[PDB]
């Protein structure tokens, strides 16, 4: 009762009919009273000569007074009264609600344009938090509603709160909710949706200073008040799922869970510590009866493993990560594909694992469903060669990859062929050899042989494909005279006898093909001018060319596309194309100009009974067998003895090659040595 | 009975105990019989001296004979018999099934690696189509099963049929199914899923030599037999939905409809004539009770409108396109958003429509939900300026666009402000003026004034944003002293008095801010110490988050090069060229949080518009009357912000004014 400090303000605050107080006088008085109360020290203060105003500052005439100033000052005063009297809690619950609706109003106006009393309201909110009087709001019979309202105030989009207060707003909402056991779903929708509805980094721009109250608030709550929020997050997940589930609309559940998963994915990125609150649901979702939810859960954890996080998922939540890798054996193929689709990014984003991955992909590469096998080989296509070489190391993967090249299934086989070839190419142009990676190389080095062995299956499409693929990735057409050979040897380095016999056969055919296209043009030129409509050979040469064209078209998958193509070329009867074509097949051409005639030739055919595109894809593959690429001025480079001694594995190839080049057709071979002499 | 031609083959084909026929002999004999029969004439032929072999060629000893050859030749022979005896069909349905399982076998082997009788089987399939004998398969009691099998054969991925036969394979399946009224769903999922599972733009990677039977077949069926297939396509859609609905799994339907929609989207791209078969379902889906199906259906047509097609959707199926644009008034906001999200790509892809769109966006721009509004203004952000200027022309769009910049809703306000600024910038650097777009320019010309008037709201965040926006799009730092002014005048060209007062105030403030930040390090170098605190708190008073500034400057001062950069940026009177160089490096290194803090301060603190530009603003050619009157307006103030300069001339001018 007795104190050293004392309230020195004693002016009336209530306007009656007998004695009236002007609005301005009342404003000034309430200002004074506010300023004075603020200064008061809680412990050292009379407090007895203050009930007068305790009783006065709750009059509805002031609570709902027109002038905002009176209301704001009243708010502050009451803020202080609460602070001084506590922990006695002088007002009754009713009065306290009446006060706390006023404070909410003040908070509401705080986000509005300045009413000239922003400062008072700043004081209000700050001091309501500092002295923790705010939480009184929670012990009221209307607390839930007041909570919802309190939250809607600050999360309202139409309000513009300054950034300075965000830490305070997160405080207010922090404390007020820390007193709650069961928070209304509404508030939680409010708090959590902000993760969905506000994604930074979405608009590339100059400063991105824009910022958002509700989001930072959500972060403050989910970071600073994690321990109390997690409990609710769990309830949010379960309740939302529960709500969607029992919904009359039967197609909502999936749509909402797919959203929850996004909420989760964001939380993991922003506040990974919270994910613990719902990780169990996911864990159980992976093993759910409905395949779709397993698919989604798989996709989710798939997304998680590729996201930047201060925390580490496999360390933190190994339990479910194991359950994640456990989905390479899910009954539903869709789930397996869903899993397998995620690896490239994972590998591309984390080296954390090369153990379970290598364990899993091995099974994924020999799965009964061709979709997953395709999605498996797609790895070698989508993620860069280097990261493959670094991350995946299991023997079985490569063997299976190459193994599928002989598979019945077409769509897999083709992709396989193309992939492992482009891979072979890239797997030499980027990765060198050491003492430890050579262990798998004996597989990457048997790629060309394997490729060349496909010819033995005798399929037109496959032969066409291998033809196309070899000259695309293996034996390229660029970029110089020496390295083509240097690599050529490395391609020939690891061959079995079959690979050599086929390699040579393919070359033995080239001369017979050249001897055919040359005569093809020599016979096609017959329509340059009238030589014999029915004269010299009219009745006989037409049926030599006509029947000759079938010979070259007997090796192509779609002969009816071949016989049609070149006849239209006879329809053309343009000399340029004939000169280039003829030039490509005549044998003995410097390697460099061949490229020049070929590229222009193919480019020329583009964009002029059906589309020429065909004719291009026909004559190109047809040329790959027809023209000389390997037996040419390369000879001159193999001729130069690159090494005095050593490198026996190179000289035996020099031999293997030249020995044959001298045998298949020596019209070219014996001449260079003559030039050398 | 009497004919000119007669069967000249009369060797036995059935091996009995008394007389045995070697396998090879049987091969040769059946070969001969095949060859002979092949040449026979269908109408002009005895046909009586043939029953002998008709009866023999159904014996299980031949039909299911071990040697593939026997079976192939038997198949061919039978194929010719069917053709010769046609249309009488002497055989029983049973025998005919037994034959047709054999033919199916042959087709099966036709896609396998060569079996040595590939020729005979090619002949088989070809002539079975030419003489149209295949369709007999359809009038059997097991026809459904044989159909399913027949289709499974060719759509089999484990089989590799040569390309030359694809047109024929599309024929066989064409005819055989053209005889069916109720096709087992299996076949239709078979035919149609192929559109989903094989996209010819996913597989190009080198030579494009790849091809696939099932797909080309599906197209042939859906193209050449469109009239016959659409009829089924309808049934496929309805049945798929019906199955999905009652599938007990309650989340199945949506996944299935979203896939059907993809099927549709592919069909429109490849065979747009077929969409007629299901366009009604979509039409009714758009007006469905469930919002989600409306949403999906809406986006679908959204997708349609952006794809290259030999046909035109708004012309062909206007009925539903109207129903699509009818979705700007759907009860469900998600649907509205879904609609509004598709336009940017559409407009950039089609000029076909500028009437209904302009009609709609006006409505979309004043929607009660801020989401649709945001996604509306996003148009001006995502699609290039030109396409905007050409495609959308309605007054309401632009007015609403600029109008939303002053709306209570924040997320709208912000995007609005930034967007119309980027638009302003791009809308002068790229688009010229004409007779009727000037009417829109007179609105686009009020962007700078509107922006500068926003400062008067006195919101820290807004002021920060407008600050950021101005120096990014309106008054950039690029590229050299000579041109900046020329356009600076053009932005200042259309100002009201407020815009000028604020424009000048911003610079009257600039010197006082410089006067502080310059003093900041000068105060940090250490009676003034308790002024440092007040200036340092003062400098952060203009910022939305001062509590992030006061920490920032302590973090930079914690060190106690950058200091020189700051001084250089703030000292005033700096060659604008170096300003850029010191400015950029500072932020680039300072970035990799704090970076976002000092920049905004610099935008208000450092000299950009009042700088070495002045010597360039002084030099004129006389000459534009619209520029020279403004140059005074500017310099006049520049003399007030800093009288250090023009104090010498004007005084002498004052004297000569006096002497007068």
């Amino acid at each position: 009762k007795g104190a050293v400090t004392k309230l020195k303000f004693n002016s009336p605050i209530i306007s009656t009919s007998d004695q009236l107080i002007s609005t301005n006088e009342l404003l000034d008085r309430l200002k004074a009273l506010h300023e004075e109360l603020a200064s008061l020290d809680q412990d050292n203060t009379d407090l007895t000569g203050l009930d007068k105003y305790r009783d006065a500052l709750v009059s509805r005439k002031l609570l709902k007074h027109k002038d905002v100033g009176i209301r704001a000052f009243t708010a502050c005063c009451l803020s202080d009264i609460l602070r001084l009297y506590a922990p006695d809690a002088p007002y009754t619950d009713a009065q306290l609600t009446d006060i706390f609706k006023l404070v909410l109003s003040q908070f509401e106006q705080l986000g509005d344009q300045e009413n000239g009393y922003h400062i008072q309201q700043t004081y209000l909110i700050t001091k309501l938090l500092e002295y923790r009087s705010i939480v009184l709001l929670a012990d009221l019979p209307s607390s839930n509603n007041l909570l919802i309202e309190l939250f809607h105030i600050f999360y309202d989009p139409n309000k513009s709160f300054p950034a300075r207060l965000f830490n305070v707003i997160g405080g207010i909402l922090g404390e007020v909710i820390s007193e709650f056991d069961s928070v209304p779903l509404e508030v939680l929708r409010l708090i959590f949706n902000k993760f969905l509805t506000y994604n930074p980094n979405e608009i590339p721009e100059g400063l991105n200073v824009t910022s958002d109250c509700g989001y930072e608030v959500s972060l403050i709550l989910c970071d600073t008040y994690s321990n109390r929020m997690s409990r609710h997050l769990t309830k949010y997940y379960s309740e939302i799922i529960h709500e969607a589930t029992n919904d009359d609309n039967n197609s909502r559940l999936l749509t909402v869970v797919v959203k929850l998963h996004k909420l989760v994915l964001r939380l993991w990125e922003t506040v990974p510590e919270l994910i613990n609150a719902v990780i169990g649901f996911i864990y159980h979702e992976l093993s759910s009866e409905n395949e779709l939810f397993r698919k989604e859960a798989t996709k989710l954890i798939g997304q998680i493993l590729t996201s930047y996080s201060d925390l580490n998922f496999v360390s933190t939540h190994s339990d479910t990560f194991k359950a994640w890798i456990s989905k390479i054996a899910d009954i539903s193929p869709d789930v397996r594909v869903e899993w397998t689709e995620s690896i490239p990014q994972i590998i591309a984003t984390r080296e954390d694992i090369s153990k379970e991955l290598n364990q899993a992909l091995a099974k994924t590469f020999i799965d009964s469903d061709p979709r997953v096998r395709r999605t498996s080989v797609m790895i070698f296509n989508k993620v860069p060669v280097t990261e493959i070489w670094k991350n995946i190391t299991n023997k079985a993967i490569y063997t299976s990859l190459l193994h599928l090249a002989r598979e019945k299934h077409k769509e897999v086989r083709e992709l396989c062929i193309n992939t492992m070839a482009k891979f072979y190419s890239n797997s030499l142009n980027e990765i060198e050899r050491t003492y430890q990676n050579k262990e798998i190389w004996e597989i990457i080095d048997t790629i060309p042989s394997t490729l060349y062995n496909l010819y033995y299956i005798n399929d037109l499409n496959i032969n066409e494909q291998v033809d196309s693929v070899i000259f695309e990735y293996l034996l390229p057409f660029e970029p110089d005279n020496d390295k083509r050979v240097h690599r050529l040897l490395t391609v020939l380095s690891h061959f079995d006898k079959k690979a050599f016999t086929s390699f040579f056969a393919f070359n033995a055919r080239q001369i017979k093909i050249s001897f055919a296209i040359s005569k093809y043009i020599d016979f096609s030129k017959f329509l340059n001018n009238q030589e014999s409509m029915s004269s010299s050979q009219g009745p006989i040469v037409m049926n030599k060319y006509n029947q000759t064209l079938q010979w070259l078209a007997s090796g192509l998958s779609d002969s009816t596309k071949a016989i049609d193509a070149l006849e239209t070329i006879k329809q053309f009867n343009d000399e340029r194309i004939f000169y280039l074509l003829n030039a490509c097949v005549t044998n003995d051409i410097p390697f460099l100009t061949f490229k020049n005639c070929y590229n222009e030739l193919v480019s020329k055919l583009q964009t002029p009974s059906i589309m020429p595109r065909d004719i291009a894809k026909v004559i190109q593959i047809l040329l790959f067998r027809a023209s000389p690429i390997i037996y040419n001025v390369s000879n001159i480079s193999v001729l130069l003895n690159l090494s005095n001694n050593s490198d026996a594995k190179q000289l035996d190839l020099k031999r293997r090659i030249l020995d044959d080049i001298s045998k298949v057709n020596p019209t070219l071979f014996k001449d260079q040595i003559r030039t050398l002499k | 009975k009497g004919a000119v031609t007669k069967l000249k083959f009369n060797s036995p084909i059935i091996s009995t105990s008394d007389q045995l026929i070697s396998t090879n002999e049987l091969l040769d004999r059946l070969k001969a019989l095949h060859e002979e029969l092949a040449s026979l004439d269908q109408d002009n032929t005895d046909l009586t001296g043939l029953d002998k072999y008709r009866d023999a060629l159904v014996s299980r000893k031949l039909l299911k004979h071990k040697d593939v050859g026997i079976r192939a030749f038997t198949a061919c022979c039978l194929s010719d018999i069917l053709r010769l005896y046609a249309p009488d069909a002497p055989y029983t349905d049973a025998q005919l099934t037994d034959i047709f399982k054999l033919v199916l076998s042959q087709f099966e082997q036709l896609g396998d690696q060569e079996n040595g009788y590939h020729i005979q089987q090619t002949y088989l399939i070809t002539k079975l189509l030419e003489y149209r004998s295949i369709v007999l398969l359809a009038d059997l009691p097991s026809s459904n099963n044989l159909l399913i099998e027949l289709f499974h054969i060719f759509y089999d991925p484990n089989k590799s049929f040569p390309a030359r036969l694809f047109n024929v394979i599309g024929g066989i399946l064409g005819e055989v199914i053209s005889e069916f009224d109720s096709v087992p769903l299996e076949v239709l999922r078979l035919i149609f899923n192929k559109f989903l599972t094989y996209n010819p733009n996913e597989i190009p990677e080198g030579l494009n030599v790849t091809s696939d039977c099932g797909y080309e077949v599906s197209l042939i069926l859906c193209d050449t037999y469109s009239n016959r297939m659409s009829r089924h396509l309808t049934k496929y859609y309805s049945e798929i939905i019906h199955e999905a609905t009652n599938d007990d799994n309650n989340s199945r339907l949506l996944t299935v409809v979203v896939k059907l929609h993809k099927l549709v989207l592919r069909l429109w791209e490849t065979v747009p004539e077929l969409i007629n078969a299901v366009i009604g379902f979509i039409y009714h889906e758009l007006s469905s009770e469930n919002e989600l199906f409306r949403k999906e259906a809406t986006k679908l047509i959204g997708q349609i409108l952006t794809s290259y097609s030999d046909l035109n959707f708004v012309s062909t199926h206007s009925d539903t396109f109207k129903a699509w644009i009818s979705k700007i008034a759907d009860i469900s906001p998600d649907v509205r958003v879904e609609w509004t999200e598709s336009i940017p790509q559409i407009i950039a892809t089609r000029e076909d429509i500028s009437k209904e769109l302009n009609q709609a966006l006006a409505k979309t721009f004043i929607d009660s939900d801020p989401r649709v509004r945001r996604t509306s203004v996003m148009i001006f952000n995502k699609v290039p300026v030109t396409e905007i200027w050409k495609n959308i022309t309605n007054k309401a769009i632009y007015t609403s666009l600029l109008h939303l910049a002053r709306e209570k809703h924040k997320e709208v306000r912000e995007l609005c402000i930034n967007t119309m600024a980027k638009f302003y910038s791009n809308s002068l650097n790229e688009i010229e003026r004409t007779y009727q777009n000037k009417e829109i320019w007179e609105i686009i010309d009020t962007i700078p004034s509107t922006l500068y008037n926003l400062y008067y709201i006195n919101d820290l965040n807004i002021n920060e944003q407008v600050d950021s926006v101005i120096f990014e799009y309106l008054l950039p730092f690029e590229p050299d002293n000579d041109k900046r002014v020329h356009r600076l005048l053009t932005v200042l060209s259309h100002f009201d008095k407020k815009a000028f007062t604020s424009f000048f105030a911003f610079n009257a403030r600039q010197i006082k801010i410089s006067f502080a930040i310059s003093k900041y390090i000068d105060f940090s170098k250490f009676i003034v110490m308790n002024k440092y605190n007040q200036t340092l708190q003062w400098l952060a008073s203009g910022l939305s988050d001062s509590t992030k500034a006061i920490d920032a400057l302590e973090t930079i001062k914690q060190f106690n090069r950058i200091f020189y950069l700051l001084n250089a940026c703030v000292t005033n009177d700096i060659p604008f060229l170096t300003f850029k160089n010191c400015y950029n490096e500072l932020v680039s290194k300072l970035q990799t949080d704090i970076a976002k803090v000092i920049q905004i301060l610099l935008f208000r603190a450092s000299p950009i518009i009042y700088n070495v530009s002045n010597i360039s603003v002084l030099l004129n050619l006389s000459s534009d009357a619209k520029q020279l009157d403004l140059k005074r307006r500017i310099l006049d103030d520049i003399s007030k912000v800093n009288p250090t300069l023009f104090k010498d001339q004007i005084r002498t001018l004052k004297t000569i004014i006096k002497d007068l």
Binding site: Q113 | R406, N458, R509, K512
Partner: peptide, 17 residues
């Protein structure tokens, strides 16, 4: 509702002292 312009031409981006 719509936000309202609420200051005069004199005090804009002003700072005392």
């Amino acid at each position: 509702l719509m936000l309202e312009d609420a200051v005069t031409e004199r005090e804009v981006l002003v700072t005392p002292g």
